[PDB]
Each structure stands twice: as structure tokens, then as C-alpha cells.
Nucleic acid binder design. Structure first.
Ligand SMILES: [Mg+2]
Lengths: 419, 474
DNA sequence: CTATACAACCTACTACCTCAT
DNA sequence: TGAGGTAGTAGGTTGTATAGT
């Protein structure tokens, strides 16, 4: 007995249609044999088609595309229906599915040129109705439709190649955790030594004015050249708040809450960063929010670091990988690094107009892919590092903040095969 | 080395209750959730606007392919896709003429030029809708470029085109057009002459100004799926959503106009499982905060909103929902929530969830070009987690955020819940955007549309509109 | 009234993300 | 798809409190 609807098609040209027809058909009740569902591994594989065409194939559907007619495999596939067209001795055994807007008669195979036009050209839906309605006129067998079958296939077959797979993969963060924090955080009732009108960010250390007291990780002794007549402050006088407590929230002072304290460290950390880049070998791109730091041309041999290419060329403009430091306390204090692409026409002189930059950055960005963005950033952190395990951020002479160059790694079972 | 759990991708359910992951495929495969009697399409455009729109209706019947049809699925064509006809033969046209366009358009003010073409279209739409015996499912506003080009703030028509000097020394036309048409509910789908006819709009070089050969199949998916939704039926539903949840999305917009800069309109948008959505319009208060750079509500208005949502839900679903998540991008003041608590039935669980796309934990896959696939999440606390709604998607073999993806912090600011369900439900909620038909959106549909919604609140403020479904606010 | 010592905006500027899609 | 628009976020500019005449 014969029930099937064999679909002969060109791939990958008519794959979008062939896949649409079969699944739509399969869902509708029909039994469709198409190369699309299987993953054949046999010599018979041609045979399987022949056996299926020979015996169990109720209808031969052929994709009437220009490619389909000129295709060696399809033409071979076609050969049988004609061979088997007679045996059935049913006129309508072979059905050109004319899906192509542009078929010259000359292209069309003679056997099927003769045949009636199943027009998927004007609309795909009418063609399905027409293909089906033609099925009604001749009693082509069907099962009650279960679209469940339709997308079991789609979900299982078509989607087979790519889907979430239980695979293991680790991802490197851009949160590089702070390692060590000054043992205390102290506040100096600087008072007379303190002048409000002065700006400390030429004070070469992280300093900020809170209330009337003075805030930093530099011991009071730290500012001399730029803050005179302060050998007058008792060592005792300033508050000395346990840092190892603050993150905990162990410190809540009704006068100042930990949330207040938590915010405060951050201007320093960032400032601490801001200074260190003052003397860490990188010219800084300034964006209003904070600085972006990009190494100038030729600082690294042939403009590469640790095998990574942190400076390059686009068009007439050199691009320079750059980074920024957000510092965040929570959940785990870390230095957050967002990556940038600065732009210079010439190796060390920055481009004037962002619009050119914004265009540059988008244009340049397209080239870098997850793999590229990670390597350059890690290296850049790798680049800054003043030692094997970490960077050095200088609050004060005896007080330093150390942040791991290598960012946190997250390991997740569940990932996808790379295409 | 922290560890990432993975959230299985939610399945949205299409015709025959058969569910999958890509609406484009889900519709292409089986069709919409509720097949609908054919769309009757009214056009509110230049006589040219009709031909182009007709170019589209005619165009979309035939399949239209994207550049790569794995990353963007192809469009089989409307009838194959939605099992119904959006016929170009069947258009119900209310014309506009350059004379109308020129006369109104040219005014020196942008606003007097904007507000009036807006008025022009509505009368043309309104007259057709109210008056017609004949019925149109969607009114499509085909905006000549000349309207788009000049009907926005910050766009300066030369002093050498303006017929009348400004009478005296918001303004986005389309949003306004939706806003004015808001009081009498009609579905407005706004199209640009350029998008429909983009190869008929060459630049000086003679190449088209904006060239869509790559994504042409895509456009149809976005337009039709939106057109389908407005015209009646939802394309799809969330596949396995536990009964009786309420997702509520809090939307505000600052009203710049007020002398006191706290005058921001308020809304909440209610999503259950369909994403057809209901927009509860809140009235205007001192929501914006100078010190806090935040949006917030007084209890008495706050109580009305939850109630307005709860009651409408009940009128809708014959019971009070056993779980209500209120999403917003901000933390909740204890007083504001406590207003929420009081309105709520005793055994209903109310969760506040702050979905903040702050720039954290950009995660770079160690090996390969592609990024972390979407659904990976890192859970900070029982309360707080990071969700990747963006990132490589294998059905697509493409990344959804075209740069390395930025996960969204999710914190149950107020309320108690299982963070794993939260991440789940939010991953689910990116799947419900009828208007932009994509595999999933970055943001859950609760907060996805707020920025667009926010204009709409303010743009029309006299009105006290009833709670309404999205197609009205889209 | 009017000095300023401060508070809290408002403003670029940039990385994302959207739509008259 | 991409030329757009939005949304973070700092701050310096700015509009309000304090304070002393
Ligand atoms: Mg839209």
C-alpha cells in the first residue's frame, strides 16, 4: 500500500519552502518523505528514496524552482516518478510545486513542463489550499491532523543541530574584585587646616569633604606639600572606623549610616584609579561621566600586549582599546570595567568630534566578537597590573587598594555548540 | 568561581495549543492563537499613501525573505502565516492631500504644526470610524515622510518655508496621534511611507536612502504581528504560566511642563499570560523626586491603582490573583508598598521586583566568538539575581544583543518570593511583545513599553481614560 | 537684604536599545 | 538593519538656604 507524499527539492535554495511545505503538510495529516527530516548515512540512501518513491509514495511533489529543474539530485529523484508514473497510471502522480516567480519555460524539465501548475507564486497559502484541494479531488490519503507531529519534527529535527545543550562553559566577568582594603577608614577633624574653597583632586590622593571631618584612606600625615600647618592635629582626634566592619553593615552610625559610608569609598576608589592612571602609561579619554583610558600608539611593541592587539587601525583612523573603572561595593566589592574604543587619526592625538567617534566606535565594534572583547579587556587589566596578582591603587603612602587583574569567573553547565 | 544556573526558555503557545519558542516560527508553523475573521484595513494617508500601503498588502501575501533566515526567520506571507486575509482589495480610505498637508504642515511652530496635522488625522480617522456603517479592524496611518521629517521637537523647518509667523513664541506626532485617539478607542497602526516603499525612495546617489534588503522579511513579521494583534486576536500566549498571576508594570513620565518639577503622569500595565495587556491610567502627581532621581507614589493614589488592577482582574477572571508581581526599574519606598499591601487581599502575595539594567556583570564567554547563551543567570542572593534576557540564542544562531550582552539585575525589592520563579517569570515576560515580533525582547513586556507609554500618558492629560488594552496604547 | 557654604538639579557623552517596524 | 532615541550616571553649573549687616 502507498500513503506517502514524497517531496523532491533543491537544497539549500528551496529549503525555506520545502521545510514549510512538509511541516505544514505533515501537520495537516499527510505523510511526507523529504530529505529534510532525515540524517541519512547509507549507500541505500539513494535507494531509500527509490524504494520510497518506488513503493510507498502516493504522490511525488517536486519543488519547481529554477534550481530544482537544473539540479542533478532532483533530476535523478525525478527520474523515478516518470518511471513510476506509468505503474500507477495515475495522471496526477507528479506535481510541480511552482514556487519560483521566475521560471523560464526553457528551464522547466520537459516531463513536468507539461503538467498543471500548483501556484505557490502568488501566495504560499493559496498554493497549500490548491495542493490540498487537488488532494481532495483525487483521494490522497490522510490521517486526522495532529500538528503535534508537525512540530515534534521541527523541534526535534530542524532544531536538532542547535539548541541548548548540557555543556560546560566558564565566563570571565568585567568585575575585578578588590583584594585588600586599608585596615581602618579614618576621618580627620581637619578643621583649621582644612579649607573648604580648595579642591583636593590635585591632592594626589583620594580626598573628599564630608561634613566638617575629612575623609580618605591616607593617614592624616599624608598631605603635606599642598596642606600646610596641619602638624597641629591630634593623632587621637579623628574617628577610626573599622573597614572590615562597614561592608558587613556592622557599622551603622546614627550620625552616618553604612549606606552613606558605602557610597563614600567609591569616589575614592575611582579617584584612586583616576590618579594611578595619572602615572600608569595610558593617555586618557575623557567622557563627561568619567575618564576612559586608552594606550597610545606604539607604547607596546608593534602595538600589541601579551599577544593581544590593544591598538589598531580603522580606515584612516587608529582605534585604541580603552577602559573605564566603575567601582561597586556590592554584592562583592570589585572594580567594574567597561570597555571602549577611542579614536585617533594619528597615533597620539585624539579625534575632535564624537560624531566621528560614535561612527568610528560602531563601525569598529562590528569587527570584535565575544572572543575579541574579552581578550583585549583582560589583557588591558593585565596590562595595568603592577604585580603578578593585582593592580596597585594608591590612596596613601602606607595604604593601598589592591584589585585583582583577572575578573571573576562564572561556570555554568549548559551552553551551545559554536556554529 | 561563582556558578550560573540556567533558566529554561519559556514556551509561547500558538494555534492548537502547540508551543515553541520563536513566534515567527510558531506562527509560521501553526498560526495565531485565535484565528480571526479577515482584517479590514482603513488607510489615513495621501493618495500615494494608499498605493504604497497597497504595495505592502500585496507584497506580504507573497513570502518575503530576510538576509539570513536562520537568524531572522523568513515571512511565509500573511495568509500562510495567520490563516487569514489582510486584503489590499479591501481598503477603506480616508484621504489627506498635500493641500491639507501643506496648509497645516507649514506653520512656524513645530507644535502648532504638529498638534493640528494630528487633529487632521483623527477627524479623518474619527469621522470614518464613528460615522462609518462600514467597519475597519485597524486604522493604519501612512505618514508621508514630510510629516515624520518635521513633526518632532528639535527638528527645524527653515525660516524660508514658513507661511505664518508663530502666533506666539507633547510634540511627537505619532504618539500624540495615539494619545488623542485614546479617549475613543480605535487601533492605530502607524507606518511610514518610507518603510513600506523603501526602494522607491532613492537618495541623491540613486541608492535607496534606507536600504532594508537584509531584513525585509523581518519587517513584515513586525508589522503583521502588530497588525494582527490590533485587529483582534493575540498571536500567542505564554505556554506554561501558573494560573492566577498578575504582572503589573509601573510606568511614569516626568511632566516637564509644570513649574513644580514633580509633575509626572503615572500608570500601571497589567499582564497576565497573553501580553494583550491592560493599561491602568493613573492620575497626575508629585511622583518624580529631586533628591532621589527616582519615581514614587503616595499611598492614596497607589491604593487606587492596585485596586483598579485587582478589581479589573476580578471582573476579568472571577477571582483575585493569588500572586501579583509589581515590576518597576526603581526600589520601592516602604510607605508606597504598604499602601499596596493594604489594598491587597489577605492571601494574595504581592511581589515588588526592581528590574534594573544597570551596567553590571557583563559576562564574556571564555571560548568562541559568540556570547553566553540567553537564560544563563547568576543569583546573587535569595532576593537578588542577574538574568540574561540577551545573548546568543541557538534557535537563532545569533546573539540577541548584538554586542556582548548586558544582563538585567532583578531584585525583589519588596515582597517575598522565590527568585528562581522571578527570573523564570521575567524570562517568560520577554516573550509577550506582540508588536515587535522577535524571539524575545530584552525587557519583560511589563516595563518594555513604559518609555513609549510615558509619552502617551502626558501627551494626553485632560482625558480620564478607562483601563485599556495595549493595542490602544501601542 | 546679601553675602556665601551648600545643597540638589541639569547636562553632556556614551553604551545600549528601539522605532513613523 | 540602523540611524535614531533612551537611559543610565556622574558631576560641574545653579537655585535655595543660612548667616551676618
Ligand atoms: Mg510598533
Amino acid at each position: 500500500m502507498r500513503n506517502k507524499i514524497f517531496i523532491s527539492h533543491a537544497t539549500p535554495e528551496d529549503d525555506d519552502f520545502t521545510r514549510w511545505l512538509s511541516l505544514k503538510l505533515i501537520g495537516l495529516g499527510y505523510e511526507v518523505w523529504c530529505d529534510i527530516l532525515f540524517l541519512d548515512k547509507g549507500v541505500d540512501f539513494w535507494s531509500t528514496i527509490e524504494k520510497e518513491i518506488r513503493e510507498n509514495t502516493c504522490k511525488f511533489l517536486i519543488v519547481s524552482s529554477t534550481a530544482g529543474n537544473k539540479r542533478e539530485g532532483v533530476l535523478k529523484e525525478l527520474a523515478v516518478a516518470t518511471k513510476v508514473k506509468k505503474h500507477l497510471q495515475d495522471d496526477m502522480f507528479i506535481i510541480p510545486l511552482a514556487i519560483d516567480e521566475n521560471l523560464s519555460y526553457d528551464d522547466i524539465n520537459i516531463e513536468i513542463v507539461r503538467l498543471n501548475a500548483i501556484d505557490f507564486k502568488k501566495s504560499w497559502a493559496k498554493g497549500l489550499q490548491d495542493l490540498l484541494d487537488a488532494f481532495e479531488k483525487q483521494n490522497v490519503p490522510k490521517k486526522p491532523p495532529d500538528h503535534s507531529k508537525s512540530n515534534l519534527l521541527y523541534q526535534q529535527i530542524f532544531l536538532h543541530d542547535k539548541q541548548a545543550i548540557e555543556k560546560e562553559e566558564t565566563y570571565d566577568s568585567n568585575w575585578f574584585p578588590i583584594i585588600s582594603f586599608p585596615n581602618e577608614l579614618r576621618f580627620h577633624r581637619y578643621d583649621w587646616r582644612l579649607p573648604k574653597q580648595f579642591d583636593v583632586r590635585t591632592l594626589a590622593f583620594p580626598a573628599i569633604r564630608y561634613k566638617e571631618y575629612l575623609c580618605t584612606f591616607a593617614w592624616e600625615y599624608d598631605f603635606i606639600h599642598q596642606l600646610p600647618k596641619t602638624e597641629t592635629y591630634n593623632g587621637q582626634e579623628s574617628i577610626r572606623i573599622s573597614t572590615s566592619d562597614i561592608l558587613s553593615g556592622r557599622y551603622d552610625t546614627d550620625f552616618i549610616r553604612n549606606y552613606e559610608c558605602q557610597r563614600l569609598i567609591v569616589q575614592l576608589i575611582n579617584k584612586a584609579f583616576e590618579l594611578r592612571m595619572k602615572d600608569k602609561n595610558v593617555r586618557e579619554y575623557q567622557m563627561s561621566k568619567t575618564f576612559a583610558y586608552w594606550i597610545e600608539k606604539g607604547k607596546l611593541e608593534k602595538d600589541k600586549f601579551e599577544k593581544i592587539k590593544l591598538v589598531g587601525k580603522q580606515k584612516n583612523k587608529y582605534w585604541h582599546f580603552g577602559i573605564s573603572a566603575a567601582g561597586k561595593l556590592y554584592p562583592s566589592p570589585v572594580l567594574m570595567v567597561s570597555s571602549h574604543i577611542i579614536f585617533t587619526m594619528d597615533g597620539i592625538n585624539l579625534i575632535k568630534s564624537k560624531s566621528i567617534q560614535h561612527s568610528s566606535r560602531r563601525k569598529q565594534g562590528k569587527n570584535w566578537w565575544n572572543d575579541k572583547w574579552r581578550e583585549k579587556l583582560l589583557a588591558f587589566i593585565r596590562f595595568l597590573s603592577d604585580d603578578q596578582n593585582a593592580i596597585y591603587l594608591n590612596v596613601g603612602s602606607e595604604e593601598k587598594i589592591l584589585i585583582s587583574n583577572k575578573p571573576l569567573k562564572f561556570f555554568g553547565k549548559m551552553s551551545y555548540v559554536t556554529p | 568561581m561563582k556558578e550560573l544556573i540556567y533558566i529554561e526558555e519559556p514556551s509561547i503557545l500558538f494555534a492548537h495549543g502547540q508551543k515553541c519558542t520563536d513566534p515567527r516560527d510558531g506562527l509560521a508553523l501553526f498560526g495565531p492563537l485565535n484565528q480571526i475573521y479577515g482584517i479590514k484595513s482603513g488607510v489615513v494617508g495621501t493618495q500615494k499613501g494608499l498605493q504604497i500601503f497597497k504595495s505592502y498588502l500585496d507584497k506580504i501575501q507573497k513570502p518575503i525573505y530576510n538576509h539570513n533566515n536562520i537568524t531572522r526567520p523568513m515571512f511565509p506571507g500573511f495568509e500562510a502565516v495567520f490563516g487569514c486575509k489582510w486584503e489590499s482589495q479591501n481598503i477603506v480610505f480616508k484621504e489627506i492631500t498635500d493641500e491639507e498637508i501643506r496648509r497645516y504642515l507649514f506653520n512656524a511652530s513645530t507644535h502648532k504644526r504638529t498638534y493640528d496635522l494630528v487633529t487632521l488625522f483623527n477627524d479623518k480617522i474619527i469621522t470614518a470610524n464613528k460615522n462609518d456603517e462600514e467597519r475597519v479592524d485597524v486604522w493604519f496611518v501612512i505618514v508621508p515622510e514630510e510629516i515624520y521629517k518635521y513633526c518632532r521637537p528639535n527638528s527645524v523647518l527653515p525660516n524660508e518655508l514658513v507661511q505664518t509667523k508663530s502666533l506666539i513664541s507633547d510634540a511627537q506626532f505619532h504618539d500624540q496621534l495615539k494619545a488623542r485617539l485614546l479617549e475613543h478607542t480605535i487601533p492605530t497602526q502607524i507606518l511610514r511611507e518610507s518603510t513600506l516603499a523603501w526602494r522607491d525612495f532613492k537618495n541623491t546617489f540613486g541608492a535607496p536612502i534606507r536600504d532594508f534588503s537584509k531584513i525585509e522579511g523581518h519587517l513584515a513579521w513586525t508589522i503583521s504581528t502588530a497588525a494582527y494583534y490590533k485587529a483582534g486576536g493575540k498571536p500567542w500566549k505564554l505556554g506554561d504560566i501558573r494560573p492566577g498571576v498578575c504582572y503589573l508594570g509601573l510606568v511614569y513620565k516626568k511632566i516637564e511642563k509644570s513649574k513644580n518639577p514633580q509633575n509626572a503622569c503615572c500608570a500601571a500595565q497589567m499582564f497576565l499570560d497573553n501580553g494583550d495587556g491592560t493599561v491602568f491610567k493613573g492620575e497626575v502627581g508629585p511622583w518624580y523626586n529631586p533628591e532621589k532621581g527616582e519615581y514614587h507614589l503616595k499611598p492614596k493614589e497607589a491604593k487606587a491603582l492596585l485596586t483598579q488592577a485587582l478589581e479589573s482582574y476580578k471582573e476579568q477572571n472571577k477571582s483575585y490573583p493569588k500572586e501579583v508581581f509589581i515590576h518597576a526599574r526603581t526600589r520601592f519606598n516602604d510607605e508606597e508598598w504598604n499602601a499596596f499591601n493594604e489594598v491587597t487581599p489577605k492571601n494574595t502575595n504581592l511581589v515588588g521586583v526592581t528590574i534594573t539594567k544597570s551596567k553590571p556583570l557583563k559576562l564574556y564567554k571564555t571560548e568562541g566568538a559568540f556570547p553566553i547563551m540567553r537564560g544563563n543567570a547568576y543569583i546573587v542572593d535569595e532576593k537578588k539575581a542577574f538574568l540574561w534576557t540577551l545573548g546568543f540564542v541557538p534557535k537563532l544562531q545569533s546573539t540577541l544583543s548584538m554586542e556582548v550582552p548586558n544582563p538585567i539585575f532583578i531584585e525583589i525589592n519588596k515582597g517575598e518570593a522565590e527568585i528562581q520563579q522571578v527570573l523564570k517569570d521575567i524570562l517568560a515576560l520577554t516573550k509577550l511583545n506582540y508588536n515587535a515580533c522577535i524571539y524575545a525582547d530584552g525587557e519583560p513586556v511589563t516595563l518594555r513599553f513604559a518609555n513609549k507609554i510615558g509619552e502617551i500618558l502626558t501627551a494626553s492629560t485632560e482625558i480620564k481614560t478607562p483601563p485599556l488594552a495595549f493595542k490602544y496604547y501601542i
